[PDB]
């Protein structure tokens, strides 16, 4: 349910022609950390939400670089957590059983990263990294005597830390309508947080029976009309 993914490519630095890894780190499928040792006018250390992280980033680059020293000597690789995975190549090789799945077999099997060091990284060291990487919302309700013969109730949730949310209209505690928000339906507030909105029409006089419930993470928040 949570995914850490390293995307790495061998490359040489302009000055001394030794090899480093350009690494891209994706937590939950979004670009999170970046180390480009051969940057020129761009930043070698990239982070989007740190400094503590970028310090570890340099360390995981060498760790990964060391593990793949033999095959480094256009090599690219993608690896990560959640179950682990590790693929290699000049794009063909996969860490299946603690062995590597591809004359081609003889060369790859020999040069491949040690299965011991690989299993440990995927089983313990990488989950820890993913673990390391990993006020309240507020709800308002407004009412309008509109349209004719109806009252419109509008529930808005502000200050959502993530883009997942459920808003429920309840009538005397009975769920009436529900909306679960996705990506492309959740609203960016523009300050890093997200917001959502559901509305409902009721008969005049029904309003005091109605309440709005926000479920977000471990938050369950009530607001009456």
């Amino acid at each position: 349910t949570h995914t850490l993914r390293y995307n790495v490519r061998a490359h040489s630095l302009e000055g001394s022609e030794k090899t480093q890894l350009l690494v891209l780190i994706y937590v939950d499928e979004e670009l999170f950390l970046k180390y480009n040792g051969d940057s020129r006018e761009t930043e070698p250390l990239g982070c989007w939400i740190c400094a503590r992280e970028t310090n570890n980033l340099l360390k995981v680059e060498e760790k990964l670089r060391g593990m793949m020293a033999e095959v480094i000597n256009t090599l690219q690789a993608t690896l990560g957590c959640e179950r682990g995975f590790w693929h290699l190549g000049y794009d063909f090789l996969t860490f299946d059983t603690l062995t590597w799945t591809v004359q081609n077999k003889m060369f790859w099997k020999t040069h491949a990263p040690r299965a011991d060091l690989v299993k440990t990284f995927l089983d313990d060291i990488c989950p820890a990294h993913l673990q390391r990487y990993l006020g309240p919302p507020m709800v308002t309700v407004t009412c309008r005597n509109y349209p004719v013969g109806r009252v419109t109730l509008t529930c808005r949730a502000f200050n959502l830390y993530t883009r997942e949310a459920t808003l429920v209209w309840l009538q005397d505690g009975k769920p009436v309508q529900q909306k679960t928000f996705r990506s492309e339906t959740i609203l960016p507030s523009g300050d890093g947080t997200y917001q959502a909105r559901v509305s409902i029409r009721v008969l005049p006089g029904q309003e005091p029976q109605f309440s709005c419930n926000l479920r977000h993470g471990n938050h369950s928040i009530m607001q009456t009309a």
């Binding site: 507020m138 308002t140 407004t142 309008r144 419109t152 509008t154 808005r156 502000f158 990506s183 492309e184 609203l187 960016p188 507030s189 523009g190 300050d191 917001q195 909105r197 509305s199």
Partner: protein, 98 residues
Amino acid sequence: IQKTPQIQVYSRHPPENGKPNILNCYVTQFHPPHIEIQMLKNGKKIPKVEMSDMSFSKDWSFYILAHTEFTPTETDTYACRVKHASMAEPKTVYWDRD
């Protein structure tokens, strides 16, 4: 092939007349990646409008967030006017507080 932009206009924080706030114009699901966005106060253009980087969605479409500082009142109207090649005419969406 072209997709028509959806437009949503809303405040960043719960609105209160006389209290400084941010008005968002969230423009989604359009294609091609060329949009023109204007924000209006009482029918007149707002000079300083911020736009986020354009983003790509998985449904093969683009979206973007425009916004401007504002202080809501009872009588001032606000709107977002958008031009895009999928539309013969500019589309205007008024801020509705509810």
